[PDB]
Amino acid sequence: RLIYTAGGYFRQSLSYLEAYNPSDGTWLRLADLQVPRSGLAGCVVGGLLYAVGGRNNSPDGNTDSSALDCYNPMTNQWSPCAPMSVPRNRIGVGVIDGHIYAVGGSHGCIHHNSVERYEPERDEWHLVAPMLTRRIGVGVAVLNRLLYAVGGFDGTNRLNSAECYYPERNEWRMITAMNTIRSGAGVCVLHNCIYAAGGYDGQDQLNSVERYDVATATWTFVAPMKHRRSALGITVHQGRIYVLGGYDGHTFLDSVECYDPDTDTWSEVTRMTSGRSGVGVAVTMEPSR
């Protein structure tokens, strides 16, 4: 399995699909996205890589995207899917029971609290209960089949609040807030907790990382990343966390850092072919040759 990064931003939105092999260290260049996009999210259902939402910042235009597109590593081909009800720049997504939940994001000046669910078997989106909070640059994770929305930006204030969606009650409940306000953080589930790494608090890009334990309903501060970064990509591969790129207030990073929970240590493992922020990252089988 490889770590796929799709899209991103590097003075304009990007169409790159590249896949990192943590063993041999190579970056594989794969089929371009049909549309350049930054601020998208990535996920895997079945063995298929999905690119959800984002925005196309181009020298000739600036359009938020409702698109959902599907990459097959067996064919090295992208295929469009039915789009979401609304464009969602700086979206968060999570997967529950083979369904994709799209959370928050922006469309122009609209800051979404809405949430919708995609069923791959039927190629259909349906709206579900909206969040308690409008959140763009929201981090999303799934733990024990519950959907967590963490941090973000509501259009006026950046957030440390987190809330939890119960699919079969179709309702959101606030949980314990993070220690640090974070928009554009990387949020994932590792082992048995929710990690929130980096982001932006309205004054600084962050290198702090904290993790939520559901048993104690508590956020705890852990070893920080080496580089502060907002709009980073994040994923879990073979029991370790990988953070990709982002923005540090001056440059679009190509640094990839790796967190080992056994040692509570971060280390730089590779550099992307080119620095970029706002990527969609997910892990799936390596392509056919």
Curated annotation (Swiss-Prot):
It is found in: Cytoplasm; Nucleus. Kelch repeats lie at residues 2-47, 48-98, 99-145, 146-192, 193-239, 240-286. It comes from the Eukaryota. The modification S-cGMP-cysteine is found at C109. Non-enzymatic covalent modifications of reactive cysteines by electrophile metabolites inactivate the BCR(KEAP1) complex. Accumulation of fumarate promotes the formation of cysteine S-succination (S-(2-succinyl)cysteine), leading to inactivate the BCR(KEAP1) complex and promote NFE2L2/NRF2 nuclear accumulation and activation. Nitric oxide-dependent 8-Nitro-cGMP formation promotes cysteine guanylation (S-cGMP-cysteine), leading to NFE2L2/NRF2 nuclear accumulation and activation. The record marks C109 as: Sensor for electrophilic agents. Changing Y9A: Loss of interaction with NFE2L2/NRF2. Strongly reduces repression of NFE2L2/NRF2-dependent gene expression. Loss of interaction with PGAM5. Changing F153A: Abolishes repression of NFE2L2/NRF2-dependent gene expression. Broadly expressed, with highest levels in skeletal muscle. Substrate-specific adapter of a BCR (BTB-CUL3-RBX1) E3 ubiquitin ligase complex that regulates the response to oxidative stress by targeting NFE2L2/NRF2 for ubiquitination. KEAP1 acts as a key sensor of oxidative and electrophilic stress: in normal conditions, the BCR(KEAP1) complex mediates ubiquitination and degradation of NFE2L2/NRF2, a transcription factor regulating expression of many cytoprotective genes. Belongs to the KEAP1 family. Component of the BCR(KEAP1) E3 ubiquitin ligase complex, at least composed of 2 molecules of CUL3, 2 molecules of KEAP1, and RBX1. Interacts with NFE2L2/NRF2; the interaction is direct. Forms a ternary complex with NFE2L2/NRF2 and PGAM5. Interacts with (phosphorylated) SQSTM1/p62; the interaction is direct and inactivates the BCR(KEAP1) complex by sequestering it in inclusion bodies, promoting its degradation. Interacts with NFE2L1. Interacts with BPTF and PTMA. Interacts with MAP1LC3B. Interacts indirectly with ENC1. Interacts with SESN1 and SESN2. Interacts with HSP90AA1 and HSP90AB1. (Microbial infection) Interacts with ebolavirus protein VP24; this interaction activates transcription factor NFE2L2/NRF2 by blocking its interaction with KEAP1. This is Kelch-like ECH-associated protein 1. The lineage of its organism: Eukaryota, Metazoa, Chordata, Craniata, Vertebrata. The chain holds residues 326 to 614 of 624 of the full protein.
